[PDB]
Amino acid sequence: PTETGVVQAVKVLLSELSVEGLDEVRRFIDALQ
Amino acid sequence: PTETGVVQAVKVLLSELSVEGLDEVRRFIDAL
Amino acid sequence: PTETGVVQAVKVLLSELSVEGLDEVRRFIDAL
Amino acid sequence: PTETGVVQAVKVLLSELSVEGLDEVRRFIDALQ
DSSP, rough: OHHHHHHHHHHHHHTTOOOHHHHHHHHHHHHHH | OOHHHHHHHHHHHHHOOOEEEEEEEHHHHHOO | OOHHHHHHHHHHTTTTTTHHHHHHHHHHHOOO | OOOHHHHHHHHHHHHTTTTTHHHHHHHHHHHOO
């Protein structure tokens, strides 16, 4: 698997989510760096 | 989430997998 | 990305789909 | 599809990505709100 493809899939999934879900994902990303 | 978007994202992910991974996903679909 | 993680994520997504969506994903696997 | 399941899948995918990919995803999330 390539990062480019995974990023594209993640964008598709995120684009439909509510603010609640987006806020949860952002907190998780901030834990990864 | 809509089914259309999730299906689209899954297809993008599957296009990156090896035959082994594709076979594992196919078996899981059979479990559902 | 590792195949193991992507496969795991795909399974989580597939557990949410209807039969119609699962059938579409299965057909796509056949295309790969 | 439920948001909870999609969020869980997104977390699995993000957890493996490089800083480059994570940075791209974050910019995208900020566009969704």
